[PDB]
Amino acid sequence: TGFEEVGGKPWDPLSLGKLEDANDTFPNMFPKSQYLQESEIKHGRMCMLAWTGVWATHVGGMGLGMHIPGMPVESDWTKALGVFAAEQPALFGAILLFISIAEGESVGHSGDNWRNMSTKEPGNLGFDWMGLTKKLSEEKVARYKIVELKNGRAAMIAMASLFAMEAIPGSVPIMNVFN
Amino acid sequence: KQSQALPFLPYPENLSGYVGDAGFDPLRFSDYFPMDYLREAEIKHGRICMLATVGWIAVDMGLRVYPVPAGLEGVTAATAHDASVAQGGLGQVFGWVAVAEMASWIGVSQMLQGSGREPGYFGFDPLGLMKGKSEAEVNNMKLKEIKNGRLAMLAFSGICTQSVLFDKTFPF
Amino acid sequence: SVFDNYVGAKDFRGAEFKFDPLKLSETYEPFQGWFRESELRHGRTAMLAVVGYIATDFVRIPGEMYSFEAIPKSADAHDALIASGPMSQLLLWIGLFDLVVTAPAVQAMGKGEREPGDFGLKWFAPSSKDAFDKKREAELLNGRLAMFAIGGIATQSVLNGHGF
Amino acid sequence: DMTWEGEYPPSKVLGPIMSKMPSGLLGLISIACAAVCAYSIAQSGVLQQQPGAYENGSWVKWYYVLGSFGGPLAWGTHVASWIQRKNGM
Numbered sequence: 001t002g003f004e005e006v007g008g009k010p011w012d013p014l015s016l017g018k019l020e021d022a023n024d025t026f027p028n029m030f031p032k033s034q035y036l037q038e039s040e041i042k043h044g045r046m047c048m049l050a051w052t053g054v055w056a057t058h059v060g061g062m063g064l065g066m067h068i069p070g071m072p073v074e075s076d077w078t079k080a081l082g083v084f085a086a087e088q089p090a091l092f093g094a095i096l097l098f099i100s101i102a103e104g105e106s107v108g109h110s111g112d113n114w115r116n117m118s119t120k121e122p123g124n125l126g127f128d129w130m131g132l133t134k135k136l137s138e139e140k141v142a143r144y145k146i147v148e149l150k151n152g153r154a155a156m157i158a159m160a161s162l163f164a165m166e167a168i169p170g171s172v173p174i175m176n177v178f179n
Numbered sequence: 180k181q182s183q184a185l186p187f188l189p190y191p192e193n194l195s196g197y198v199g200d201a202g203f204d205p206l207r208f209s210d211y212f213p214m215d216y217l218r219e220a221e222i223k224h225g226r227i228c229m230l231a232t233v234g235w236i237a238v239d240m241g242l243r244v245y246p247v248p249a250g251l252e253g254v255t256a257a258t259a260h261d262a263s264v265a266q267g268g269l270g271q272v273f274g275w276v277a278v279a280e281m282a283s284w285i286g287v288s289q290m291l292q293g294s295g296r297e298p299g300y301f302g303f304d305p306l307g308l309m310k311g312k313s314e315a316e317v318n319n320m321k322l323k324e325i326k327n328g329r330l331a332m333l334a335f336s337g338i339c340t341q342s343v344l345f346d347k348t349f350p351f
Numbered sequence: 352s353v354f355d356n357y358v359g360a361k362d363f364r365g366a367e368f369k370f371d372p373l374k375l376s377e378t379y380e381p382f383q384g385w386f387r388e389s390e391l392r393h394g395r396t397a398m399l400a401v402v403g404y405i406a407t408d409f410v411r412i413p414g415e416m417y418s419f420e421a422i423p424k425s426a427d428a429h430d431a432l433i434a435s436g437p438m439s440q441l442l443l444w445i446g447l448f449d450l451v452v453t454a455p456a457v458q459a460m461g462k463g464e465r466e467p468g469d470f471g472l473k474w475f476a477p478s479s480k481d482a483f484d485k486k487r488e489a490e491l492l493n494g495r496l497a498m499f500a501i502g503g504i505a506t507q508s509v510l511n512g513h514g515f
Numbered sequence: 516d517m518t519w520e521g522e523y524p525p526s527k528v529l530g531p532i533m534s535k536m537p538s539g540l541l542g543l544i545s546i547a548c549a550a551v552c553a554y555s556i557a558q559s560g561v562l563q564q565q566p567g568a569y570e571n572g573s574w575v576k577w578y579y580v581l582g583s584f585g586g587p588l589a590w591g592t593h594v595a596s597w598i599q600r601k602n603g604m
């Protein structure tokens with residue numbers, strides 16, 4: 001299971017995953033469980049890349065300083081997209097167009113997961129590409145889905161931690177022991 | 180079942196009448212558009228180009244109307260368009276093509292809603308030439324019109340491009 | 352199941368070589384007809400490319416724009432013919448072929464009425480399908496080898512600068 | 516007649532031409548109309564600011580006006596591409 005930090009049962013204190021069938025007043029105005037699971041996996045996958053992008057481009061201590069020769073040079077991650085979209089406009093568009101086509105294709109084949117009418121399981125974007133649902137057993141790929149979910153939730157808290165430091169400069173005291 | 184012009188592609192299956200058929204159409208415009216419209220457009224593109232390639236060849240090889248009206252004196256076929264619209268000329272040609280094309284539009288519009296009109300059929304056969312001919316001979320002459328029209332479409336496009344790009348008259 | 356639907360599970364010694372480590376033909380099983388039509392297209396392109404690099408280093412077509420004085424070895428034939436015209440001429444006609452022929456060919460392949468790789472050159476094609484299947488794996492093996500050969504030739508002629 | 520049920524309309528709501536077109540052809544047409552519209556808007560932007568090419572509305576080109584109306588054609592052909600894909604072409 002993936003509920004080991006929160007007991008052994010699913011965790012929902014505000015009961016936000018029950019809002020759609022709680023009453024009858026706002027019909028299909030709240031997403032059902034397939035959209036909520038797919039948005040949880042997608043927010044976690046973006047936060048797993050985004051926290052790595054702040055960590056790999058931070059030039060101070062404990063954060064490893066990677067750089068691509070040819071890219072614009074702004075180690076401040078809160079302004080690096082503005083200097084990349086201005087100096088490399090064709091590369092910025094080709095990345096966005098790839099993100100655009102992948103995002104529309106991810107629901108263009110399936111159905112309405114907002115209304116639990118989708119035909120695919122949430123998180124599966126057809127990007128296995130190397131094994132591994134065919135290679136690994138059925139309980140190993142179920143273990144690795146819980147791993148990607150929990151590493152996605154951990155990086156989501158981490159990106160909320162980075163969002164909070166830039167807004168309220170005393171939000172995270174643990175991020176002061178690394179400098 | 181297989182296309183004749185492309186014997187690895189299947190037959191497009193909407194070309195089964197239509198005397199000039201090679202089974203050619205790879206992009207399958209006959210699958211999406213009405214074939215009565217497509218053949219009417221091919222025929223009209225053909226007989227316009229048959230007049231155009233003969234009119235461009237005649238004007239480039241001498242042959243002005245005599246006597247030459249004012250403003251068309253030193254003029255080739257690649258510069259006779261704008262010179263004729265300033266003289267008058269094409270303004271009257273455009274007026275009478277417009278009343279022919281507005282009347283033929285009612286023919287095309289009624290053909291696509293029924294009416295049994297053949298694509299590329301007007302009443303224009305004043306010199307006889309079809310006085311009780313058999314349908315195997317009528318369809319043969321329709322094939323000569325579409326084949327010669329298909330050639331003059333590629334010919335005029337060759338003549339008009341080469342006369343302007345390399346800047347010459349038709350015996351290049 | 353791409354090894355039973357299609358032919359080419361061989362190595363350089365002729366032994367049976369089921370080579371799909373990433374299992375792309377099972378992950379993308381509807382795409383395996385496209386995978387073979389594009390493997391042959393990459394193969395048949397690289398076989399003409401490896402010949403056209405070696406034959407250029409000795410023979411040019413007889414024009415002065417194509418001469419040995421203009422393009423020194425073979426590696427400047429791309430960049431010193433872009434604005435000249437011959438690279439734009441082949442870009443037109445291959446792109447016209449790919450729009451008018453190949454794109455209706457790959458949709459007829461997906462509908463199931465033509466085999467992938469078949470563009471109608473059946474003159475020297477033998478019958479007795481296993482004999483044709485032996486010709487396809489000879490096309491595949493010479494194709495797959497040329498895809499590394501044109502990778503080797505065009506890379507080594509830039510870092511070392513030597514011809515052949 | 517044109518009423519429909521379920522998750523997707525039938526092909527016949529696209530008219531008599533696009534109801535027979537493949538979803539991949541309508542999808543690639545849509546990117547072609549979107550790229551022509553985005554090129555027409557960007558090139559009319561650089562014609563507006565060029566100091567010898569904007570006077571008395573000389574920045575307006577007929578091919579850039581006609582190209583910019585690929586925008587609503589790119590919207591419709593990508594909606595039509597989705598409908599043909601849901602209908603199995």
Ligand code: CLA
Pocket residue numbers: 078079081082083085086089090092093094096097
């Ligand atoms: C090779 C030729 C070429 C050229 C010259 C351009 C040029 C351009 N492209 Mg294009 N593009 C190209 C090829 C090209 N592109 C290709 C091959 C593709 C793929 C098909 C694209 C697809 C594409 C897309 C999708 C977009 C562009 C856009 C642009 C414009 C960028 C302007 C900009 O970044 O301001 C951005 C503004 C700034 C950098 C100023 C802000 C800086 C402050 C300080 C930041 C402060 C923080 C901020 C508030 C936080 C915001 C976060 C939020 C964005 C999430 C520029 C005119 C963009 C555009 O403007 O479209 C209308 C755009 O969205 N292009």
Ligand code: CLA
Pocket residue numbers: 100101103104105107108542593594596597
């Ligand atoms: C607003 C009208 C609108 C509608 C009804 C659709 C509908 C569709 N889109 Mg499209 N799309 C749109 C705008 C729209 N789109 C815009 C603005 C973009 C960015 C350029 C796209 C980029 C896009 C891609 C890459 C893909 C689709 C696809 C699809 C289809 C499947 C659902 C999906 O994945 O899209 C999701 C679309 C969005 C999340 C963006 C739309 C959100 C809008 C802005 C909401 C606000 C609407 C507002 C009331 C009025 C619009 C004002 C206008 C100026 C924007 C569906 C037919 C897929 C497809 O099947 O193509 C064949 C697909 O792959 N769309």
Ligand code: CLA
Pocket residue numbers: 396399400401402403404406407410411412413417418422425428429432437441444445448
């Ligand atoms: C990968 C394919 C390929 C490409 C992109 C090139 C590209 C080039 N060749 Mg090379 N060539 C090739 C294969 C290729 N060649 C092959 C296989 C041979 C041996 C016959 C040659 C022998 C050759 C000579 C003798 C010369 C060139 C020259 C050149 C350069 C310019 C003129 C030209 O196009 O030559 C004309 C092309 C040929 C002579 C080869 C004919 C093509 C063969 C028969 C395959 C085509 C078959 C296929 C079915 C055609 C379908 C076309 C499609 C649109 C319908 C250009 C960089 C010229 C140069 O000076 O280089 C700098 C030059 O003098 N090539």
Ligand SMILES: CC(=O)O[C@H]1CC(C)(C)C(=C=C/C(C)=C/C=C/C(C)=C\C=C\C=C(C)/C=C\C=C(\C)C(=O)C[C@@]23O[C@]2(C)C[C@@H](O)CC3(C)C)[C@](C)(O)C1
Pocket residue numbers: 101104105538539540542543545546549552556583584586587589590593596
């Ligand atoms: C298999 C195969 O073959 O290919 C595959 C390849 C691929 C890519 C993977 C696939 C896909 C996904 C696709 C194609 C997604 C495409 C989405 C696409 C292409 C488009 C949305 C436009 C939205 C809006 C709001 C646009 C304009 C909206 C407006 C309002 C305007 O333009 C206004 C304007 O006009 C006027 C009114 C006045 C002008 O003066 C000014 C302007 C211009 C401003 C497919 C489907 O699987 C097919």
Ligand code: KC1
Pocket residue numbers: 248266267268269271272273275276
């Ligand atoms: C039946 C009604 C009718 C009248 C009453 C009329 C009259 C004139 N035509 Mg017109 N005309 C047609 C019909 C009529 N025309 C038709 C069916 C066509 C084929 C589409 C046609 C084509 C041309 C061309 C190419 C030219 C042309 C001209 C003149 C000009 C001669 C004055 C003169 O003879 O001294 C007088 C006003 C020439 C010109 O000078 O235009 C400024 C000229 O170049 N016409």
Ligand code: KC1
Pocket residue numbers: 435436437440441444445
């Ligand atoms: C059937 C219609 C047709 C015409 C009307 C035509 C015309 C010209 N071709 Mg093209 N061409 C093909 C077809 C046609 N070509 C085909 C099917 C192929 C194989 C893909 C092809 C390939 C090349 C290459 C490699 C070159 C080339 C050129 C020229 C140029 C001068 C030719 C001359 O006078 O000898 C004129 C405009 C050369 C050039 O000078 O480019 C600056 C050049 O290097 N072509």
